[PDB]
């Protein structure tokens, strides 16, 4: 997986095998994020989170 995300700096989009949402793994802290938080960069996500704009 090789994408740009305006996620908070602990970014890495993972996703469940059969269940339908992603989960955002932090590599540098043992933690994860579920939906776009206040520390996120929506501008750098609008180019990501939607295909048509």
From TrEMBL:
Q: Does the keyword Flavoprotein apply?
A: no
**Residues of the WW domain:** 5-39
What are the GO BP annotations of this UniProt entry?
co-transcriptional mRNA 3'-end processing, cleavage and polyadenylation pathway; positive regulation of transcription initiation by RNA polymerase II
GO-annotated molecular function: chromatin-protein adaptor activity; peptidyl-prolyl cis-trans isomerase activity
- GO cellular component assignments: cytosol; nucleus
Question: What are the record keywords, sorted?
Answer: Isomerase, Rotamase
Q: Would the keyword Isomerase be found if you checked this record's keyword annotation?
A: yes
- Domain of life assignment: Eukaryota
The name of this protein is Peptidyl-prolyl cis-trans isomerase
- Organism, scientific name: Emericella nidulans
Q: Which lineage ranks, top first, belong to the organism behind this chain?
A: Eukaryota, Fungi, Dikarya, Ascomycota, Pezizomycotina
């Amino acid at each position: 997986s090789m994408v740009n995300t305006g996620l908070p700096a602990g970014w890495e989009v993972r996703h469940s095998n059969s269940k339908n949402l992603p989960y955002y793994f932090n590599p540098a802290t043992r933690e994860s994020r579920w939906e776009p938080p206040a520390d996120t960069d929506m501008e750098t996500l609008k180019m990501y989170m939607a295909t048509y704009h």
